[PDB]
Design a protein around this ligand. Structure first.
Ligand SMILES: Nc1ncnc2c1ncn2[C@@H]1O[C@H](COP(=O)(O)OP(=O)(O)NP(=O)(O)O)[C@@H](O)[C@H]1O
Length: 307
């Protein structure tokens, strides 16, 4: 395989002000913050993620693996990893996705989200994955919750705490999101780019139903059996057969039968030129979608390139 020559940047703690808390609980704490690189006269909105103070070998092992992945990817639809800070408690520094994650965004905005946005997201999510696929990299945790919103017109794939790289990954134990996983994954712990496709379909279904919970009510235990019966998730109200048909394709038992991300890009992108043919939403046409006196030298991460 090719040599992975990505650079890992180590940041001085003194190079960045924290400003507000964003997450807290599930593993670490996430902060809104600003990063003023060395003597650069730029300021970069970032998300700082250090881990729940007290440190365990078990924890750092994962944040660094994550950092390994995030640093080795460079696409407009995959999260930008900026660098790490090696203080007692290891901090991950990434691009601030101001509007939070997509799952929350859809719930909190259903009455103003139009087919144009929905299909654009679908397209942009597909491109992220196609790209990961070129880098021969398997996400293993694609879901509405793991796509972040930099602006409503620009989403990016995130969360590489499970990402892997061989024809199919053969996992061990650990806590897994059942309701998003292909069947080969549930029964054999096999993960290919095609099991990622399956989780794509579920993600799309999450978006089309404005953030429902797949198989809400059904417990994880039954799922393998349900999907074995031939059952899939229902057709979202707003969804033309065309769109839903693409979703169903994602959820086929013969994994080679499912579409390739590069095909998903094509199909959604066609649809995205005539959004209202493919998504029926009441109100569509009549719908549309920072805060410091000190914001003079602010530059989004996406314009802050380094060689
Ligand atoms: N780079 C970022 N920019 C903006 N908001 C973020 C960023 N990273 C995380 N958040 C927010 O903080 C929440 C929780 O942090 P996060 O670490 O993403 O979730 P988690 O519960 O630890 N598990 P996972 O979904 O696997 O990351 C997310 O759902 C986002 O709303």
């Amino acid at each position: 395989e090719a040599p992975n020559q990505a650079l890992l940047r180590i940041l001085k703690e003194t190079e960045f002000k924290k400003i507000k808390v964003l997450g807290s609980g599930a593993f670490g704490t996430v902060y809104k913050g600003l990063w003023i690189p060395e003597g650069e006269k730029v300021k970069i909105p970032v998300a700082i993620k250090e881990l729940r103070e007290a440190t365990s070998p078990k924890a750092n092992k994962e944040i660094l693996d994550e950092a390994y992945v995030m640093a080795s990817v460079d696409n407009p639809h995959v999260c930008r990893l900026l660098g790490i800070c090696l203080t007692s408690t290891v901090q991950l520094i990434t691009q601030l996705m101001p509007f939070g994650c997509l799952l929350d965004y859809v719930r909190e905005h259903k009455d103003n989200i139009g087919s144009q946005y929905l299909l654009n997201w679908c397209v942009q999510i597909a491109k992220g994955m196609n790209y990961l696929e070129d880098r021969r990299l398997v996400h293993r945790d694609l879901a509405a919750r793991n796509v972040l919103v930099k602006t409503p017109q620009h989403v990016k794939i995130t969360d590489f705490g499970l990402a892997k790289l061989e024809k199919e990954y053969h996992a061990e134990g650990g806590k897994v999101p059942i309701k998003w996983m292909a069947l080969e994954s549930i029964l054999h712990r096999i993960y290919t780019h095609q099991s990622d496709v399956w989780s794509y379909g579920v993600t799309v279904w999450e978006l089309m139903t404005f953030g429902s919970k797949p198989y809400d009510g059904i417990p994880a235990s039954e799922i393998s059996s349900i999907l074995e019966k031939g059952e899939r998730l229902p057709q979202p109200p707003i969804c033309t057969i065309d769109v839903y048909m693409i979703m169903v394709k994602c959820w086929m038992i013969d994994a080679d039968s499912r579409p390739k991300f590069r095909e998903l890009i094509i199909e959604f992108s066609k649809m995205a030129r005539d959004p209202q043919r493919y998504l029926v939403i009441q109100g569509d046409e009549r719908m549309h979608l920072m805060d410091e006196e000190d914001m003079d030298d602010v530059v989004d991460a996406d314009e802050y390139l380094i060689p």
